[PDB]
Structure 1
C-alpha cells in the first residue's frame, strides 16, 4: 500500500506517550511551571533552528513537487478567508478584529514539526520519503504567507484599543511583518535556504555531527514540553465559548483537511493515478495535524483570547489523536480485499484493547487501592470499569482464538459479549443513578438490583442468544459469529440503554482559648471542612461527562447495527461504521482512563498512606527546607498573613491560628514568593516539613484545598 499503516499506532504511542509523560511529570510537580521554561527555550531556540538548518541545507529544490505546496497553500488561504469573513461579520463589535486575527490562525496552523513529523516518518519512510520535506516547506511558508494577515489584524485591534490621531497603516503592517520575521522558524529558514544556495547541499562534516546531535533532541523533547505546557489549561467555558471552540476544531480538523484533499485532487497533474491518490491522502492527513502550540504563545504575546485559544490547542491535540487514527485507517481501507479488511480491523481492535486494558488496570488499581470505590456512584463506575476491562481481555483472547473450534469458542464469545452488554447497560445504569441522586437526597437506589441488573440482564441476554441461533459460519468478527439473531440481540440490548441514556440526562438537566490542636468542639471548623470534603469526592460532573462520551459511541453502535438490519448493504458505507464500532467498543477504556485514571485525587492522599504503610512495614523492628523556613519566619511572618491566618470562635474555644490553603497559595502567588499554584504548594509542603505549618487536627496533609491549617509557632 501507499502508507505503512501498521506502524502508525506505535508512532502515535510515541507521539502522545511522551506528551502524557510530559503531563504526569508536570502534574506530579516533578517539573514546575518555571522549570518548564528552560526546556521550552532549549527546544525553541537551539533544537528547532538546528533541525530546520540541517533539514533544508540538504534539501533539493529542483526535485520538489510545487503543485502539492500550491494546493496546500490555497486550501489554507481559502479556509483562512472563510473564517476571517465569517468572524468579521458576526463577532462582537468591541473585539471583532481580535477574534478575526487569531481564529484563522488557529484553523490553519498545524503542529507538524513536533507531532506531524514522527507520524509522517512512520507512515512515509519506506514508500514516499519525499513527503517528509513538505513539513519543513509548507509550515514555514504558510508561517509567513498567512500569519502576517492575522498579525496586522491584531495590530488593528490593539490600535482600536489605543486609538490616536493616526490615519496611515504602514506602521502596523511593518510591526506585523517584523513579528513574523522575528520568529526563529522564519529567519532560520531564510538562513538555511541562503546557505543551501551558498553550498551544494553538503553540510560541512565539522558541523554535521553537532547539528545532528542538537536536532535529534527536538522531537521527544518538544513532545515532553508540549505535555508540560498542557497542564492546567482547559477550564470551564461559557456555552458561547463551547460552540465557538466546536466550530474552530471542526474548521481545523474537519474543514481544512477536506479542503486540502479537494485542492490536491483538483490541482495535481501527476500521470500516475496511484501517486495521485497517495498525494491526496497525504494532504488530507497533513490537514488533520493538531493546532500548533505557537498559536497560544502568539495569543499571550498579544494578550487577547488567551484562555480560549489555549484550551482550543489542548483539546485539538486530544481530538487529533483519535481523529488521525480513524482517518488514516479510513484512507487505507479502500485498497484491500474484505478478508484483509477483517484482518486489519481485528489487528486495530487488538492493539486498542491492549493499550486500553493497560490503562484500565492502572485506573482500577488506583480506585481499589485508594478505598474510594466504597461509596455508591464510585462503586457503580467501578463496576463499569471492571466490565470495560473484561471486554478488553475478551477481545485479546478472541484475537488469539479467532477461527478455532467451537468448544472454547463458547466460553470466549460469552466472556466477550457479556462484558460488552455489561458496559452497554451500565452506561444507562449510571445515567439513572445520576438522575435519581439529583432528583433527591437519600434516594433508596437499591444497589443490589442495579448490580444484578447491569451484570445479570446481560447474562440472560447472552444466554438466550446462545440457546438459539445458527452459530455455524466461518465468521471472523465477533458481531457475526452467531448470525442475524446475534445482531438482532445486540440491537435491542443496545437500544434500551440509549433509551435509558436518552431520558435520564434530560431530567438530569431538568433537576439541575487554644493555639495547638483543638478539641472536636474547639476544632468544630475542622469538622466543617471535613464534612465539606466528604461532600466532595463524588465527582458527579465527571460521571455525567463519562456518560455523554459513552452515549456518543452508543449512538454510533445503534446506527451501525440498524444499518445492517434495515439497509442490509455494505456498499463501503458499512465498513467504516464497522471500523468505528470496533474502535469504540474496545476503546472505551481510553475515555474511562482519561476521565478517571488520572484526576486531582491521587496526588498526596493515597501517596501519603502508601508511604506510611511502606515505613510501617519496617517500623516494627527498624537543609534547603531549613533555609526556606528561615526565610519565611524572618521575612514573611509579619506580612499579610496576619489577616490570611484567622479562625472564628469555634463554639466556645478557637485556635485563632489557622489559615486556608487556597488562600495561602493565592497569597504566595500574589506576593511572588512562588511562581504559580504548583510552586506555591511545593513551598507549603516544604514549610510543613519544617515544622512551621500543620493542620489544626493533623488529619490531612497540606494541599490546595478548602482545608484549614494551623501556623504553629
Structure 2
C-alpha cells in the first residue's frame, strides 16, 4: 500500500491522544486562561509562521504537479458553488448571502497541519514525499482564491446592515502573509535557510502540531449547543457534503484531470475528509455570526472525521491486496476492538456510578456493556487451548445478541432470569462437541451465530427510551451482520469484504453507540 495503514492506526491514536489531552486539560482547568491565551499567541504568532516559512522555503518547486493541485482547487471551488447556490435557493434573502458565505467556507477548509499532515506524512514519509508538499500547496491557494468570495459575500451582509468602499475594500490572516512571504524569500534565496535562524525555526515550528491540537482541545470544551430544531439537520448536511461528497468530487475531478494515479486519487479522497479548520472558526467570531452552529461543526467535524478517515483509509486499500484481506480485517477489528475497550471501560464506570442496576432496561443495558467488554477483552487475546479460551469470548460475542433480544423483550414490556440464562451456553456446547471468530471451525460457527443473531432481530421485530433508541441503533447492525451471515453461508466478489468490514465495525463499535446511550 502507498499509505502505511499499519502506521495509520498508530499515527491516528497519537494525534487523538494529544487532542483529547487538550480537551481534558480544558475541562479540568489544569491550564489557566492566561497561559491558555499565552499558548494561543505562541502558536498563532510564533510557531505557525515559523513552520510556514520553514517548510515553504524548504518546499521544492522543481516539480509542481499542476494537475493534482488545480484539480483539488477547482473541486473545492465547485463545492463552494453548489453549496452557495443551493443555500441561496433555500435560505431567506436576509440570511441567504450570510448563509452562502460562512456555510461554504465552513464546508471547504481542512485543518491540514492539525491531523492530516501528521497522518498523511506517517502514511507517506517514504513512499510519496510529494504529498507532504501538496498539503501546503493546496490550503494556501484555497485561502487566497476562495475565502475572498465568502468574505465579500458577508460584506454584502454588512451592506444590508459601496463596492470599492467595503465590498472589495474590506473583502481582501498571518497564514497568507507569511505564506506568500515565504515564496518571496524562496525566490530570493536558493530555497535554502541559514543555520542561525534555521535552528530556531526548527525548534519552534516542530513544536506546533501537538500544541495546535492542544489549543484545539482547549477550544472544544463547552462548544456544542442543542440545535436540533433546524440546525443539526443542516449541520450534518454540511458535514456529509464536506466529508464524503467533497472527497468524492475530488476523486472524480482528479480522474478527469490527472496505479500511482489511483493511489493519488485515493489521496484525493484522503483529502477533503479532513475535519474543518479553525480559520473559519475565527472568521465567524470576527463576523460574530451564529458561532454555535459553527463551533458545533468544529466539534463533530473531528468527532466523526476521525472514524471516517480511519474506515475510509482501510476501505480504499482492500481492492489492492484475499489472504491480506483477512489479515487487514483482522487487524482493523483488533484495533477498533482496543479503542472499543476504551469506550467499554468508560461505559461500565459511568453506569455503575449512576446506579443503572435499576429494574428498568438500564440494568439490562449494563449487561450489554459488560458483555461487549468481555468481547473486547477477548479481542486482546487475538494477536499475541488458546482457542479453548476463545470459546468463552465467542460465547460472550453471542451474548451481546441474546442480551439485546431480551432487552427488546423488556422494551416490549415497557409498552405492555433469561438474562443470565444465555442459550449461547448451548452454542458453546455445539462449539466444543459438535484465525477469526467466523473461522472458528468449518461453516457451523457462523451458522450457530446466523441463527442466534436472527432470534434477537426477530425478538426485536416482536433514560429507558434512550435505551430503546440504543436497541434500535444496534439492531441496525443486527441486520447488517445478518446480511453477512446469510451471504457467506449461501455463497462463500469485492462485495462480501466491505460488509465484513461493516459487521466488524458494528460487532466491534456498538460499544460506542451504547457509549453515547
TM value normalised by structure 1: 0.67
Counterpart secondary structure, 1:478? coil
TM-superposition CA deviations, 1:9-61 (whole Å, max 9, x none): 11100111111111122222323566533322222221111110101011111
Cα distance in 1 between the residues matched to 2:103 and 2:426: 50
Contact 2:395–2:428, Cα closer than 8 Å, also in 1:
no
Alignment of 1:245-264 (within 5 A): 245-264=235-254
Cα distance in 2 between the residues matched to 1:169 and 1:496: 70
Distance change (3 Å), C-alpha of 1:264 and 1:375? same
Cα distance in 1 between the residues matched to 2:413 and 2:284: 44
Post-superposition shift, 1:218?
0.7
Post-superposition shift, 1:420?
1.6
Post-superposition shift, 1:481?
2.6
Distance change (3 Å), C-alpha of 1:554 and 1:168? same
Cα distance in 2 between the residues matched to 1:240 and 1:133: 40
Distance change (3 Å), C-alpha of 1:184 and 1:429? farther
Distance change (3 Å), C-alpha of 1:88 and 1:366? closer
Cα distance in 2 between the residues matched to 1:455 and 1:298: 56
- Root-mean-square deviation (CA, aligned residues, Å) is 2.8
Cα distance in 2 between the residues matched to 1:540 and 1:232: 26
What 5-or-longer segments of structure 1 have no aligned partner? 162-166, 177-182, 269-274, 399-404, 440-451, 470-476, 503-538, 596-713
Distance change (3 Å), C-alpha of 1:330 and 1:78? same
Contact 2:360–2:464, Cα closer than 8 Å, also in 1:
no
Contact 2:340–2:508, Cα closer than 8 Å, also in 1:
yes
Post-superposition shift, 1:394?
1.9
TM-superposition CA deviations, 1:155-189 (whole Å, max 9, x none): 1123223xxxxx6465212212xxxxxx1111110
TM-superposition CA deviations, 1:466-520 (whole Å, max 9, x none): 3786xxxxxxx31243344432333333234444556xxxxxxxxxxxxxxxxxx
Contact 2:356–2:366, Cα closer than 8 Å, also in 1:
no
Post-superposition shift, 1:379?
3.0
TM value normalised by structure 2: 0.91
> Which structure has the larger Rg over C-alpha atoms?
1
Cα distance in 2 between the residues matched to 1:72 and 1:572: 28
Cα distance in 2 between the residues matched to 1:53 and 1:458: 65
Contact 2:3–2:120, Cα closer than 8 Å, also in 1:
no
Contact 1:120–1:131, Cα closer than 8 Å, also in 2:
yes
1:299 maps to which of 272, 284, 292: 284
Alignment of 1:378-393 (within 5 A): 378-393=362-377
TM-superposition CA deviations, 1:600-629 (whole Å, max 9, x none): xxxxxxxxxxxxxxxxxxxxxxxxxxxxxx
Post-superposition shift, 1:557?
2.0
Distance change (3 Å), C-alpha of 1:322 and 1:153? same
Distance change (3 Å), C-alpha of 1:245 and 1:206? same
Post-superposition shift, 1:431?
5.1
Cα distance in 2 between the residues matched to 1:91 and 1:206: 55
Post-superposition shift, 1:120?
0.8
Post-superposition shift, 1:307?
0.9
Cα distance in 1 between the residues matched to 2:142 and 2:10: 29
TM-superposition CA deviations, 1:418-455 (whole Å, max 9, x none): 2122223434544554565587xxxxxxxxxxxx4344
Corresponding position of 2:477: 553
Distance change (3 Å), C-alpha of 1:53 and 1:386? same
Distance change (3 Å), C-alpha of 1:555 and 1:31? farther
Contact 2:26–2:221, Cα closer than 8 Å, also in 1:
yes
Distance change (3 Å), C-alpha of 1:152 and 1:73? same
Cα distance in 2 between the residues matched to 1:223 and 1:311: 17
Post-superposition shift, 1:561?
2.9
Counterpart secondary structure, 1:455? helix
Distance change (3 Å), C-alpha of 1:168 and 1:396? closer
Post-superposition shift, 1:410?
5.8
Cα distance in 1 between the residues matched to 2:289 and 2:500: 43
Post-superposition shift, 1:541?
6.6
Contact 1:421–1:458, Cα closer than 8 Å, also in 2:
no
Moved more, 90-99 or 208-217: 90-99
Counterpart secondary structure, 1:278? helix
Distance change (3 Å), C-alpha of 1:458 and 1:320? farther
What 5-or-longer segments of structure 2 have no aligned partner? none
Distance change (3 Å), C-alpha of 1:86 and 1:279? same
Is 1:326–2:275 an aligned residue pair?
A: no
Distance change (3 Å), C-alpha of 1:168 and 1:350? closer
RCO higher in structure (CA 8 A, sep ≥6): 2
Contact 2:223–2:299, Cα closer than 8 Å, also in 1:
yes
Corresponding position of 1:28: 28
